[PDB]
From a paper:
In this study, the impact of glycosylation on the bioactivity and biochemical characteristics of FIP-nha (from Nectria haematococca) is described.
The double-glycosylated wild-type is denominated by WT. Unfortunately, none of the structures contained a density indicative of N-glycosylation. The lack of glycosylation in our crystal structures may have been due to the nonuniformity of glycosylated protein or the flexibility of glycan chains. Double glycosylation significantly enhanced the pepsin resistance.
Author numbering:
A (entry chain C), C (entry chain D): 4 to 114
B (entry chain B): 4 to 113
D (entry chain A): 5 to 114
């Protein structure tokens, strides 16, 4: 459970690097509804896309919003859930889809 | 570049490690049809399942065949493509699905 | 071929990560003398130490100077070289020393 | 959960097997560690080993030949001037990456 060997592999591999995937869940007009997810600074080395899983159900992948001036990127669950937000009773999982190999890495989970 | 720092990080966590994901593509009744995939020694720390993508198209996930006594495991594309094999013209991608987080890692491509 | 899986392992392990190990080599009173090295933003999860080898010769390990307000950290080669700087003619390697396991990772190299 | 790192190693090298499970060899008075044996080492590089005995750096030595079964042995008599290391003392064994000079801990005694 000490990954300093992994950390400095990245240090040696990419001399400068900075990211922040701390989840910011945006609520909706009835507050019991989660409408979106916001990352403060996303990785930009590749055009990543996002897949949303609502309570086990695959909502698919959709075109990504542009990374904004502060480095943030937003996932709008209304794009995935047919114009609706996801109830807070339900579990939400968000994966990044690597465009090069098609891999998927879990980057946010609710409940 | 040089990923020995990643190898010896795994060495520190799991002293023992052995795998072989060399793709063995088995052809079908016309030799131009790919029917299955065999990995000589798969990882067994978790019950992995497989996802198959035929020329960009998601064929989904299916229950996995048992890991054989020699460590092998077989992906039967007839299970994923409704009993037919994939033509050598099409691209096929096979992902391992981590049952813990739902991650997907590509382990074979034609 | 593609280490995005290692990046996103780190996203999962530590939501936020930010570093810059771009070498800023500080020259000395004769311009051909390299007296110190500064990293703009170093990793701070442990009090790392640094080992300097001057042209294959081990000058040893020394305590780090405190991480500065801007996150930078500097290695002063005079602490390693008996009060004198290293000529820019010779090759310099700087290793990070993980204080918990004693591992050593190369983070900067000159000429 | 580090499966994402594991399938990175799979992706890069289809086939790989190693075992650094420490096998400590005792000495003529049993209160002595004479050597360490790794059952199957990585051989993609000529790694060397550095020993630290109770905080003391004993340096690097040429590595013993990798044996037919894939093993490699570190002989503490080579590092400790023809003597074994008392078990009361701490032993650390680092692999030296010959390419960058990195050092990764692969064995530790008490």
């Amino acid at each position: 459970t000490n990954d300093s060997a992994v950390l400095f592999y990245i240090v040696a591999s990419q001399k400068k690097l900075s990211f922040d995937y701390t989840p910011n869940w945006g609520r909706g007009s009835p507050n019991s509804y989660i409408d979106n997810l916001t990352f403060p600074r996303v990785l930009t080395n590749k055009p990543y896309k996002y897949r949303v899983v609502k309570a086990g159900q695959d909502l698919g992948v959709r075109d990504s919003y542009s990374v904004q001036s502060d480095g943030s990127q937003k996932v709008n669950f209304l794009e995935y859930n047919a114009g609706r937000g996801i109830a807070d009773t339900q579990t939400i999982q968000v994966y990044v889809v690597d465009p090069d190999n098609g891999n998927q890495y879990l980057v946010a989970q609710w409940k």
